PDB file of C-alpha atoms in Angstrom:
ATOM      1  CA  UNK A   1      42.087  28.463   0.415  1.00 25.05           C
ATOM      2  CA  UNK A   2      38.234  28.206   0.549  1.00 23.00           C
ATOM      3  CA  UNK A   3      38.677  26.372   3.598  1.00 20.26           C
ATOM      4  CA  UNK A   4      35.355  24.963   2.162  1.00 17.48           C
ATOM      5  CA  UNK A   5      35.846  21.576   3.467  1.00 15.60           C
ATOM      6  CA  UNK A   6      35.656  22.945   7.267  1.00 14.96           C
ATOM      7  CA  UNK A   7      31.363  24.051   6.019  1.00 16.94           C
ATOM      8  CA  UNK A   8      31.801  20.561   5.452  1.00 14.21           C
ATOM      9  CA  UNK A   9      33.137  18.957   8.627  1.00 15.39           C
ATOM     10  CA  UNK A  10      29.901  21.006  10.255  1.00 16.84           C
ATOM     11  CA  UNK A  11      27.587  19.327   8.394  1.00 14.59           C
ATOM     12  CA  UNK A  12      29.494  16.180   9.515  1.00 13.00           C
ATOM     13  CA  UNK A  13      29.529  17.161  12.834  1.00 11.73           C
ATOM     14  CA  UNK A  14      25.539  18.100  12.958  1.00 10.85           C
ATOM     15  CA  UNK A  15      24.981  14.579  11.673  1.00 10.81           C
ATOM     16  CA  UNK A  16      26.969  13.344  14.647  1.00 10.32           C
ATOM     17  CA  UNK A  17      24.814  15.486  16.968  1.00  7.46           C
ATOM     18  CA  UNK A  18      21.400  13.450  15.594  1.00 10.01           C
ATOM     19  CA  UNK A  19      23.232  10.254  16.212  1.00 10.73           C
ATOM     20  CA  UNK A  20      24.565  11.309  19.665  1.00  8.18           C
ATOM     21  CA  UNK A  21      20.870  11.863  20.650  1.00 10.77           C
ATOM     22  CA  UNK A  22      19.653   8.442  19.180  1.00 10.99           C
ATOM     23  CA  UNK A  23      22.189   6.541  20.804  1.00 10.98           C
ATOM     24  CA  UNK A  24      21.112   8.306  24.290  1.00  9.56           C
ATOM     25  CA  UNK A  25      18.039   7.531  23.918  1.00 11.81           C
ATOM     26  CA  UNK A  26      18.317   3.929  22.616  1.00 11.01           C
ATOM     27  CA  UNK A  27      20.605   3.518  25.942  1.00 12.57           C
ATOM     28  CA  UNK A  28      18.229   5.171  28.796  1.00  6.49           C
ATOM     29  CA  UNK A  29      15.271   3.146  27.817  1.00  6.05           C
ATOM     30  CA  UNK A  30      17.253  -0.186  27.798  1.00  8.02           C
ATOM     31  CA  UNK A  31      18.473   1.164  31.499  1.00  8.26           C
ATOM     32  CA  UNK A  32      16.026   1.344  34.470  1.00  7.26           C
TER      33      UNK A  32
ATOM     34  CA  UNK B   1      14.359  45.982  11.296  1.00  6.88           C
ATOM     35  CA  UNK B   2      14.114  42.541  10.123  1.00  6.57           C
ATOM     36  CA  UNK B   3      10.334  41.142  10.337  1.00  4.49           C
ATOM     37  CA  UNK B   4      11.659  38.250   7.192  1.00  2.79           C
ATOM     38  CA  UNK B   5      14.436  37.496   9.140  1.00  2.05           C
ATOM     39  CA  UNK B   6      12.048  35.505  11.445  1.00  5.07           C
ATOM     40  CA  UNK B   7      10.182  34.073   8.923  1.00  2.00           C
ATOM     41  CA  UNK B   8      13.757  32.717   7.365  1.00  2.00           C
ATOM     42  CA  UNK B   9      14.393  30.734  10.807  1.00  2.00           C
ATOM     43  CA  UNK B  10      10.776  28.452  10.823  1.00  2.00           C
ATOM     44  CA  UNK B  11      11.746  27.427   7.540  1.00  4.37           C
ATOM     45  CA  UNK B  12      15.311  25.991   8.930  1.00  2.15           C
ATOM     46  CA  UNK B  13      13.708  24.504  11.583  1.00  3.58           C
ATOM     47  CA  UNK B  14      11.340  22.339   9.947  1.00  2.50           C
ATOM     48  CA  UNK B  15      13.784  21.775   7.659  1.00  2.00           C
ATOM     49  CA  UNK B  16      16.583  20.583  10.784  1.00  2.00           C
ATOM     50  CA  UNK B  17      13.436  18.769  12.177  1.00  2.59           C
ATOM     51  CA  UNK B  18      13.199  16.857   8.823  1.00  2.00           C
ATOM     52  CA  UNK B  19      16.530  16.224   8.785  1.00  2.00           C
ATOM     53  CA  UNK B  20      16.067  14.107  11.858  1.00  2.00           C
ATOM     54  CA  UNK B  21      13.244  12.475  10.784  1.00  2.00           C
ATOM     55  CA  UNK B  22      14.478  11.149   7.561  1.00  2.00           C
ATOM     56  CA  UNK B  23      17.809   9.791   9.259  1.00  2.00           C
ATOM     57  CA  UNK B  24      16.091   7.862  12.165  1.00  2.00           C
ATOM     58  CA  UNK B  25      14.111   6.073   9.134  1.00  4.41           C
ATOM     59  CA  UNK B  26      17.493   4.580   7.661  1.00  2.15           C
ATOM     60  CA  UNK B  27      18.971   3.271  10.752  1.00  2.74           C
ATOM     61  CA  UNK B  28      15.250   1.925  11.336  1.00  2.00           C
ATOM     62  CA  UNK B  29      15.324   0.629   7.915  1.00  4.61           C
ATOM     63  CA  UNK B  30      17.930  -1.487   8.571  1.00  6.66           C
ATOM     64  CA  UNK B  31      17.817  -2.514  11.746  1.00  6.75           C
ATOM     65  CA  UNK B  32      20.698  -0.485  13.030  1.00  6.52           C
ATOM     66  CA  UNK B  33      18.115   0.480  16.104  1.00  8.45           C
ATOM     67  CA  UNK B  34      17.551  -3.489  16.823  1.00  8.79           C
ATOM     68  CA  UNK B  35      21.121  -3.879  17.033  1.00  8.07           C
ATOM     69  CA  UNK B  36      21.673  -1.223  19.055  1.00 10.28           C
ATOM     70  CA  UNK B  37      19.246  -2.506  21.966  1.00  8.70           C
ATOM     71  CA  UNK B  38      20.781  -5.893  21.432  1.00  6.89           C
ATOM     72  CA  UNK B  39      24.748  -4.215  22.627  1.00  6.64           C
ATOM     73  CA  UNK B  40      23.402  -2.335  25.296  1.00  7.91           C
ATOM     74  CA  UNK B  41      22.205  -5.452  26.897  1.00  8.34           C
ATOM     75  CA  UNK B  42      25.163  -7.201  25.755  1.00 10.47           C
ATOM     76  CA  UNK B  43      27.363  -4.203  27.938  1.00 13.98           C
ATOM     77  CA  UNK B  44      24.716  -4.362  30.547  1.00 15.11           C
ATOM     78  CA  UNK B  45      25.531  -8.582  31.102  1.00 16.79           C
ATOM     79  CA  UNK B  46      29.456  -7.729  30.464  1.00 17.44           C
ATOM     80  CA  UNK B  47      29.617  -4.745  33.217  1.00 20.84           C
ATOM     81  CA  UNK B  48      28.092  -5.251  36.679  1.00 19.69           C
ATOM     82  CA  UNK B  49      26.796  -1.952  36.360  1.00 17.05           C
ATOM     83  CA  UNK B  50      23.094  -0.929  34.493  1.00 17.92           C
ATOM     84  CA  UNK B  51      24.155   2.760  35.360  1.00 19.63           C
ATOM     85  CA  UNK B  52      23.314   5.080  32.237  1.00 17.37           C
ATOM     86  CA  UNK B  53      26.489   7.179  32.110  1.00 17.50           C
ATOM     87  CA  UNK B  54      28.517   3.955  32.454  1.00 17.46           C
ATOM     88  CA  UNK B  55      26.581   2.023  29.836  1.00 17.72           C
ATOM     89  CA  UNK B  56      26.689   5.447  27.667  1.00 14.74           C
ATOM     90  CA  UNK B  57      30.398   5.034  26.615  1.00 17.32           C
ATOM     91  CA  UNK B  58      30.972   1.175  26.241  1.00 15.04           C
ATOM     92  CA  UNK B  59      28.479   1.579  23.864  1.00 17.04           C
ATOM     93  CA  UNK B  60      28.141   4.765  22.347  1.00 18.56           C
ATOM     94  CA  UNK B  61      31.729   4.802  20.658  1.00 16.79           C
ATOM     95  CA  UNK B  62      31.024   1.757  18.721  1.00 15.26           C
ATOM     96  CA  UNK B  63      27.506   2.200  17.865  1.00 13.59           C
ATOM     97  CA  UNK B  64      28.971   5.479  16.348  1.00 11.73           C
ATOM     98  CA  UNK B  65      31.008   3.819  13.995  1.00 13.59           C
ATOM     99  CA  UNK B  66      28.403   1.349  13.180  1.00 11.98           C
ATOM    100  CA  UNK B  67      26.487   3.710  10.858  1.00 15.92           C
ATOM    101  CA  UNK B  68      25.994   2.270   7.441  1.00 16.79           C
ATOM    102  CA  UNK B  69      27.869   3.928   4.736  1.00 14.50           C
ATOM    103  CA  UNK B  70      25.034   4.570   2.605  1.00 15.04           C
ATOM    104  CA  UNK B  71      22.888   6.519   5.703  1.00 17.16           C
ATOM    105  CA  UNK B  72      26.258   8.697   6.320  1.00 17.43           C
ATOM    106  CA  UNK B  73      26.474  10.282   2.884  1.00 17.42           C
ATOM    107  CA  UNK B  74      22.463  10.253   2.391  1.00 15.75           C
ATOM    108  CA  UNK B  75      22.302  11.974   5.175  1.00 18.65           C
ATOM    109  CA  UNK B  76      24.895  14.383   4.736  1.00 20.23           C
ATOM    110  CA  UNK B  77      23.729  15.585   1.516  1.00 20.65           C
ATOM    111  CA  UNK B  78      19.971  16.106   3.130  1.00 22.49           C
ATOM    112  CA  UNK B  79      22.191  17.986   5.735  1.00 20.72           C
ATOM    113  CA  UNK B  80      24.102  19.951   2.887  1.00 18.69           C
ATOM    114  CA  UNK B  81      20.487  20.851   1.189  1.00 16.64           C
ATOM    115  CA  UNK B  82      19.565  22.446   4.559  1.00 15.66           C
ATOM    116  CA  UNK B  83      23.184  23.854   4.993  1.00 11.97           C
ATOM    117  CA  UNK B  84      23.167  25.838   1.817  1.00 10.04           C
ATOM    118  CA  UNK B  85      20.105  26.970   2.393  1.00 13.05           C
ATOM    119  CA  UNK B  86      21.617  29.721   5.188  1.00 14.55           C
TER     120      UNK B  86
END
């Protein structure tokens, strides 16, 4: 069992990381 | 010990840098960003509240899933490129 696909779920989850900070930021200029 | 071990780790982040570049440019592209600003105001006249950590995740979990298909799988081979690389 490789377990290759679980290199591949942290690729996913870096990708979620660089849209985490885009949707912050998108947010806190819209509020204040 | 290891002098090229540090030289290894400027490469990855330029590369991790580019990697963020490249995937703010699709969601640009297609107006993902425009639509973004247009729910947060949208949550903003729905909630009484303009609070940032309340706004955060009314919108956040959608806007998540909004990503086009195309940008996810671009992306993720741009991220697999860099990946591989270590």
């Amino acid at each position: 069992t490789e377990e290759t696909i679980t290199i591949d779920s942290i690729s996913n989850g870096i990708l979620n990381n660089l849209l985490t900070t885009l949707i912050q930021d998108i947010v806190a200029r819209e509020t204040t | 010990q290891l002098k090229s071990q540090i030289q290894q780790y400027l490469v990855e982040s330029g590369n991790y840098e580019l990697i963020s570049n490249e995937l703010k440019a699709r969601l640009l592209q297609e107006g993902w960003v425009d639509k973004v600003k247009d729910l947060t105001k949208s949550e903003m006249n729905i909630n009484e509240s303009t609070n940032f950590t309340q706004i955060l995740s009314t919108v956040e979990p959608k806007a998540l899933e909004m990503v086009s298909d195309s940008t996810r799988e671009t992306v993720l081979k741009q991220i697999r490129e860099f990946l591989e690389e270590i």
